[PDB]
Design a protein around this nucleic acid. Structure first.
Lengths: 333, 126, 225, 394
RNA sequence: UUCAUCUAGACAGCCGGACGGUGCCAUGGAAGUCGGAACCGCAGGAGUGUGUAACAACUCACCGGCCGAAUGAACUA
RNA sequence: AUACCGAAGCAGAAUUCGGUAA
RNA sequence: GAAUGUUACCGCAAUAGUAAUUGAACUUAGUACGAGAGGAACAGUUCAUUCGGAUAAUUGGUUUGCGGCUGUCUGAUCA
RNA sequence: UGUACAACGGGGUAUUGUAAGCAGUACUGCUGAGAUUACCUUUGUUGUCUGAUUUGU
């Protein structure tokens, strides 16, 4: 057994705690250092191997790729940090004036029984000329060194019975922390898309809690060197609008995703599998730095995508395939 | 990834006109760190076999043998998962100079590409 | 005229490529040494098609044809066939063949005049070859080997048979095929002369290990010089 | 075995051999001493066996090699050193078998080393001789007796030094003195598509070198090309050279002899007295005469539906130094991928990106895909519209 | 602590002289310097090493222009 | 447990030795 | 899972467990070397084996649910 | 007290290949049928939406 991955004690929460960020680039424009989303099932994808010298070089090759259910990231605040001899410390936290019901639920377990006195008087302080809630920005500018944005996911968009919001801190790539806080404030209550941070062929890393076998499993894990193959937009239609297979369909498997994960929002395709099963929230990061190897730098296309259901063994790809061979079906037509 | 299917000593069929009828895989090369679990042959693998039925030169003397078929369903990166007639092999020197002047039956694409001379001596592919 | 090459430190020159008087076919990979010779001897007078057959690197042994056209086996993929049709000019035909055996180069020896095929060739395929290639088809048993193309090589100007070919067979076939025949070797005595070299009526390529006497014999028999 | 030699292991006489084992190796006390003896003795035996096996024996190889070793090193000493090494190994085995057969136990192990050192250290002189001969035998040329060979003999530095250099690839000093070429020289050249080897020797003027050359000439089948000069190179008169050539007369005639020469032309008649020799003028600083001599030596040793050629095919001229240049400009071949688009002969300049759907959600597109199916499109479609007058669902 | 050098120039360090008869066996080259056996004419070995087939050329030990007083070798602790 | 240094008449391949280190 | 303010959310980390591992192919190669066979090499690329984490794209030992097969029988086929 | 919770049959999904009968020509058209469907789905109807304890510088 691995010595580093011991003891095997289970994680304390579904969300995996991120404790490392890709340094701090003082020259890059302001951008998010990571992304948050939810994990769906898995599928299959094939692409052309442009890698030189490979056995399957310049040939179509099948690769296993998972699908991450990514809801839009709506900013709710930002957190500043200051260097100290006792380690990094969060000097001040601020919020985006207004908070959705899902965000308020995160602070409540018996939400229905509670009088729902969530963020309210704080908004009353904001409901004026600003003063303290505006001087906090100046205080952050004066002393802060690294600023982490505070965002939550649109859980109600995800097909999850649990409507409680999930929130985590994300560091800002850009320098000039004044610009960091200015951009964060301007983005208060705004919605951020995947294209604003990640991009196709980027070697992102995945971190999440492992599957529980029902103590084996249910522990946080980090997987690095995973290449994105296509930015997905499940809000629209015809997600399979690739250059090949001009018979546009949807990435959703027949009858919906197995067990759970009926995609109804943005999604992303990532090379290989991801730790943990569906219904688990997964955070994405740029993998610190980008390797210069062809396996990490080369860009890839996409073609065949499997759509047959897995509620059994799998056969039918689309409902329109059932005709001709079955003759008459008086029960239906 | 190389599986652990066919073990040492499998009396696989012979598909060459050298006069051999069966190939007993007495020895398998490439057995390095795969301890505890016995090695296994595979398509295009470097293995040696002794012809059970044949002349004395091929009895008690171990010579390399190249496997051209496996019968057992195998995974492929191309996305195909079919299988064909049966497992087969040929007797050749370590450099691939097959003694048999002709080869019968299909030859796996996995081994044909990595053994140019073996493929050249075979007509049926896949 | 004959060239020297060592594809990826290998010796089977003809396995990874096929050549005719009007077009050239070569395998694909990472090494450029093998592709260098074709440009050196011809530059771009004929299309040097970098292509694979059925996803295999044994393109030379998997394809048979002559100046009048080319044909590919069943296992060739739809993408392969489409890109081959988009690689060859309209003046050159392309054909697909359905049969149990697939290695056309190992099954059929093709020249500009007469095509030699495996004796078990089906009637349909036997008659099909003549139309596209415009050549006669006669079953052949060179050297008493059922797989004539697995080791033999026959250019339009002659025929370099593998060393296992008997003298009587060469004498019988020289006056029947109307072409000269000589038994020799390549790659410093390799018996598979059909894999270690490619030869036509003006161009030839041989492995690095090929000795001077073999090169001279190949040049003289085929009337290159 | 190999005509040349270099794989022979090296020998480090005296302290080095002892250390190689001492440093490696360095009632349970008795067992530990037994284990130590079972390792030191085995190491010594392995070293002795490696020394014996690696070093070839004078009389165990080809008689020509035996003679060559005899004339280079000391004949008797070569066998004496081997006998001494064998005796040392036997004594080591005897010592090991003797042992095989606190205050008191402390002295048990000492005797083994005390006697192994006595056995071994005394072999320094034979070991020194072995090491000395190892260096000389590890660089012997390829004096192959089987392949056709030619030799040259005569007075040293009469222009002979440059003859082999100008006949085949070789570097020979032309400095004039007793023997500029102290040892044998070998050169390889190809004729008639078969290998020919040229070898040279200083000459004969006794000394160990003279006997070595004489025995090499006699044992081998190589022809001897005696060297002379029409001019007076080296300063020796024609009579002295003729007498020296006659000195080699008793054993040179059976090798298909020739003579190469750089009132003057009349005195050479004495050289022609031997019917077997052939004499011709030549020079060591030019190519035509040496090549003629080489060709003559090789000749002497030899006895010991119509074709289709397009005009464009012959129009292009062979390139004079390529894919190497293209991929080199592209930053490498193995590190660079192959390219298809825009290279292969596209059917047309319009559809540069045919993407073949190759999927029908149940079957491959190519199962029925075909071009110019417009006529079928205006006929088959009527089957899905004529249902009004029938209805196949019934 | 013993011996030695003593502005008749201590020791380190630069430049020069380092010659003559001249040598025999190995003869193939060996002349100081691969190996046989050990003089002296006037600060200098028939030679401590480098190196050439060997002379060739540098050299240390010995002296000279040279520097301006402690210094070189072994011991006692 | 593997390799890193210096040496061998170590041309290359290849080999041995003194130190580091398990 | 017990206690310092009640409760809960997001964070820092004193501290401790450490992880990778071996072979193979191209190009530098028939290059430097070298009479000759034989054959360097850095760097740039492509794979698997030893071991570790993952998930089921596929495979694999692994809802009597759909087709029918036997017996006691409802009388009689439908059960 | 809003498609908030949950029942359903439907719909997709997975599975099977000629079921109950009737057309007699000693198995033939309905009939690749009916069918279940603890995975997704909850579209219309329909039911529920109110309890005990404790905490508090």
């Amino acid at each position: 057994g691995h010595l580093g991955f011991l003891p095997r004690k289970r994680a304390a929460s579904i969300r995996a705690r991120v404790k490392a960020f890709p340094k701090d680039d003082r020259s890059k424009p302001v951008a998010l250092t990571s992304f948050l989303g939810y994990k769906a099932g898995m599928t299959t994808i094939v692409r052309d191997l442009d890698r030189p010298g490979s056995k399957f070089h310049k040939r179509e090759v099948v690769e296993a790729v998972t699908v991450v259910d990514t809801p839009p990231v709506v900013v709710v605040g930002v957190v500043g940090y200051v260097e100290t001899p006792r380690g990094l410390r969060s000097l001040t936290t601020v919020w985006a004036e207004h908070l959705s019901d899902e965000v308020k639920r995160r602070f409540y377990k018996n939400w229905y029984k509670s009088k729902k006195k969530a963020f309210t008087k704080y908004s009353a302080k904001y409901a004026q000329d600003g003063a303290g809630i505006e001087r906090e920005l100046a205080r952050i500018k004066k002393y802060a060194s690294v600023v982490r944005v505070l965002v939550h996911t649109q859980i109600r968009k995800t097909p999850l019975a649990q409507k409680k919001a999930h929130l985590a801190e994300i560091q800002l790539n850009g320098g000039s922390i004044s610009e960091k806080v200015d951009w964060a404030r301007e983005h208060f209550e705004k919605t951020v898309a995947v294209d604003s941070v990640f991009e196709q062929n980027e070697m992102i890393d995945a971190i999440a809690v492992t599957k529980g076998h029902g103590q084996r499993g249910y522990h946080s894990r980090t997987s690095i060197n995973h290449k994105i193959y296509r930015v997905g937009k499940g809000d629209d239609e015809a997600n399979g609008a690739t250059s090949f297979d001009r018979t546009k369909k949807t990435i959703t498997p027949m009858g919906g995703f197995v067990h759970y994960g009926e995609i109804k929002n943005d999604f992303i395709m990532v090379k290989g599998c991801i730790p943990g099963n569906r219904k688990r929230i997964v955070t994405l990061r740029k993998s610190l730095y980008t390797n210069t190897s062809r396996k990490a730098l080369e860009e890839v296309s996409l073609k065949w995508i499997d759509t047959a259901s897995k509620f059994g063994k799998g056969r039918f790809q689309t409902p329109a395939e059932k005709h001709a061979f079955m003759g008459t079906l008086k029960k239906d037509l | 990834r190389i599986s652990l299917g066919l073990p040492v000593g499998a009396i696989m069929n012979c598909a060459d006109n050298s006069g051999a009828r069966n190939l007993y895989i007495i020895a398998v090369k490439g057995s390095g760190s795969r301890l505890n679990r016995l090695p296994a042959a595979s398509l295009g693998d470097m293995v040696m076999a002794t012809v059970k039925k044949g002349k004395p030169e091929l009895r008690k003397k171990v010579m390399p043998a190249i496997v051209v078929r496996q019968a057992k369903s195998w995974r492929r990166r191309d996305g195909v998962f079919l299988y064909f007639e049966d497992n087969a092999g040929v007797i050749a020197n370590p450099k691939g100079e097959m003694k048999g002047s002709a080869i019968t039956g299909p030859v796996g694409k996995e081994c044909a590409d990595l053994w140019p001379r073996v493929a050249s001596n075979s007509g049926v592919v896949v | 005229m004959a060239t020297r090459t060592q594809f990826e430190n290998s010796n089977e020159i003809g396995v990874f490529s096929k050549l005719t008087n009007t077009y050239c076919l070569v395998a694909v990979g990472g090494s450029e040494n093998f592709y260098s010779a074709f440009e050196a001897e011809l530059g771009d007078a004929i299309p040097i098609v970098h292509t694979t057959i059925a996803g295999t690197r044994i393109i030379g042994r998997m394809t048979a044809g002559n100046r009048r056209g080319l044909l590919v086996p069943t296992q060739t993929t739809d993408q392969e066939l489409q890109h081959l049709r988009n690689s060859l000019p309209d003046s050159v035909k392309i054909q697909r063949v359905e049969e149990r055996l697939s290695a056309l180069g190992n099954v059929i020896c093709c020249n500009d005049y007469v095509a030699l095929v495996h004796p078990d060739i089906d009637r349909e395929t036997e008659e099909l070859i003549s139309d596209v290639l415009g050549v006669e088809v006669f079953r052949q048993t060179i050297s008493g080997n059922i797989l004539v193309g697995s080791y033999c090589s026959l250019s339009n100007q002659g025929g370099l048979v593998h060393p296992q070919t008997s003298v009587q067979d060469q004498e019988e076939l020289s006056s029947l095929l109307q072409v000269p025949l000589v038994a020799g070797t390549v790659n410093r005595g390799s018996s598979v002369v059909g894999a270690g070299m490619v030869v036509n009526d003006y161009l030839a390529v041989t492995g690095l290990d090929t000795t001077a006497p073999e090169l001279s014999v190949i040049e003289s028999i085929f009337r290159l010089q | 075995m190999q005509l040349s030699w270099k794989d022979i292991p090296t020998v480090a006489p005296a302290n080095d051999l002892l250390d190689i084992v001492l440093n490696r190796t360095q009632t349970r006390i008795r067992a530990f001493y037994m284990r130590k003896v079972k390792y030191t003795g085995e190491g010594f035996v392995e070293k002795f066996e490696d020394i014996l096996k690696g070093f070839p024996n004078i009389n165990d190889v080809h008689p020509f090699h035996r003679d060559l070793m005899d004339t280079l090193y000391e004949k008797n000493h070569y066998k004496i050193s081997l006998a001494a090494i064998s005796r040392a190994k036997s004594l080591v085995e005897q010592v090991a078998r003797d042992y095989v057969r606190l205050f008191q136990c402390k002295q048990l192990k000492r005797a083994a080393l005390g006697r192994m050192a006595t056995i071994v250290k005394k072999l320094r002189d034979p070991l020194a001789y072995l090491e000395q001969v190892r260096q000389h035998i590890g660089r012997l040329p390829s004096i192959d007796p089987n392949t056709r060979t030619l030799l040259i003999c005569g007075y040293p530095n009469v222009g002979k030094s440059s003859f082999l250099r100008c006949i085949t690839k070789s570097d020979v000093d032309v400095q004039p003195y007793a023997f500029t070429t102290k040892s044998l020289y070998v050169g390889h050249f190809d004729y008639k598509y078969l290998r020919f080897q040229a070898i040279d020797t200083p000459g004969i003027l006794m000394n160990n070198i003279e006997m070595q050359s004489i025995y090499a000439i006699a044992h081998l089948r190589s022809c001897v090309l005696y060297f002379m000069d029409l001019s007076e190179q080296c300063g020796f008169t024609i009579e002295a050279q003729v007498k020296l050539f006659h000195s080699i007369k008793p054993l040179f005639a059976n090798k298909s002899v020739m003579v190469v020469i750089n009132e003057r032309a009349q005195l050479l008649e004495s050289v022609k007295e031997v019917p077997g020799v052939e004499i011709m003028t030549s020079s060591c600083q030019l190519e035509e005469n040496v090549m003629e001599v080489r060709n003559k030596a090789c000749e002497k040793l030899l006895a010991s539906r119509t074709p289709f050629i397009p005009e464009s095919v012959k129009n292009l001229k062979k390139y004079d130094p390529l894919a190497r240049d293209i991929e080199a400009e592209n930053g490498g071949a193995g590190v660079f991928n192959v390219n298809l688009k825009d290279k292969y002969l596209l059917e047309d300049d319009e559809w540069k990106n045919d993407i073949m759907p190759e999927i029908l959600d149940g079957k491959n597109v190519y199962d029925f895909l075909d071009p110019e199916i417009a006529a079928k499109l205006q006929a088959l479609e009527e089957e899905e519209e004529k249902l009004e007058n029938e209805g196949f669902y019934n």
